[PDB]
Amino acid sequence: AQNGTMMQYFHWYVPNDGALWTQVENNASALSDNGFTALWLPPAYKGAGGSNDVGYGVYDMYDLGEFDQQGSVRTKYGTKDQYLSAINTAHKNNIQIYGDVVFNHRGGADGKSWVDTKRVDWNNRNIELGDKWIEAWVEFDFPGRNDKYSNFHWTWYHFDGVDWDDAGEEKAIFKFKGEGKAWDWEVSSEKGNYDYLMYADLDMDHPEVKQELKDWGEWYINMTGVDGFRMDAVKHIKYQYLQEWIDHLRWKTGKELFTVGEYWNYDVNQLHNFITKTSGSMSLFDAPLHMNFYNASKSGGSYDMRQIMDGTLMKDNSVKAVTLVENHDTQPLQALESTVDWWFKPLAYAFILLREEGYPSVFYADYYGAQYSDKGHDINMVKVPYIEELVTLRKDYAYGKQHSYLDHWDVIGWTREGDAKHPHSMAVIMSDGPGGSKWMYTGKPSARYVDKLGIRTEEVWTDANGWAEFPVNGGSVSVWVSVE
Ligand SMILES: [Ca+2]
Ligand SMILES: [Ca+2]
Ligand SMILES: [Ca+2]
Ligand code: NA
User: Fold this and answer.
1) How far is the CA of 237 from the centre of ligand 4 (A)?
2) Which of 144, 190, 249, 380 has the most crowded Cβ, counting Cβ within 10 A?
3) Residue 142's domain spans which residues?
4) What is the CATH number of the domain that holds 117?
5) Is 262 a catalytic residue?
């Protein structure tokens, strides 16, 4: 019935105070009222960085902040009990939970082992540079967990490679040798073969790894009650195994288990290839759309708004698109920083929230604002104007057939006819440059429209044929709504 709306409920620089799960539980009610129906939460298990780990330095995925490992019992975000209680409170408020799943690598090993390896080139991992015996951090036993839930132990042959030799003290990519040992395929062919990223790289061709990740996945579903998954770093993970894994869990549990992968590349054709090679078993974040928004926001009005959707999953395959404006990899001070200019974000959010295409995601730092410091640089991410109102507008009014007018280089818009449970009409209009107006068809005859954002104060009426001329301020967005 209701439009689905997800939120990335974290960012990179959340404080290390063990409070995020408590904050989920305390805000679930308010978030549901706004219109959020699902939260993507950060990796909930213990990382190599201890409580400082954002979660991607994954060490023990069976330790949800329950065991004394890597310097604390809790994770960055709280304890295991707080996690389960937050998920339960989300469910009572009609909010689903997508858990972040980090399968590419493991870090923070309990011990090192001598491994016979081939050094490979950083920029082409198929170029071999010489054999070397190394000491690799690849023994994972989780002694603080004492075999609760699982006695599985990771050793060298579960991994394809590392980037650190502890004996010779050399940083280089060392590919493990052995019968059947190779970089996995298919993965991104960037850098020749992009299987290797960081820490100890999982060998997705090893039978014991393939089974262990399935075992953990069923345990995690039954332990936590999560409703689906956000898959980390999928361009570095054997595509066929990712499909194998989610296919298995959907079959074993009978649950829908909505899944979205992070394939972070701005050429949509690499994302299309991933979706083809995984048989459409998961959505992907619309990374190319973020870069369209970034470019438009830095263009001073000169961006061709007719093309704001071009080369995106939102356009090419919208039922596999999780749309977004910003995330923890693009926010300020991160390696892949490309932060959308603040002035444009109300437009970008109105675009992903009020268009019929795709499954929109709101960024925590955009919804709440965020202040932080790193490397001596102080960052102030200001809450996006109208962000709560736009989420409400999606919840209550953006329904029914859509008529699109991406037909001018500044002024674009679209209309939504409404449906039976939501019998209101809407016309969205925005401009990245000077203001203007556009004739658009809503299909609602002789009806009164007002700007639910309160920027334009006049009334707009359709004629007897459902057509009206809607106005918009420069560098702005208006959301015209004719309630029933
Ligand atoms: Ca392999
Ligand atoms: Ca990999
Ligand atoms: Ca323009
Ligand atoms: Na691998």
Assistant:
1) 7
2) 249
3) 106-207
4) 2.40.30.140
5) yes
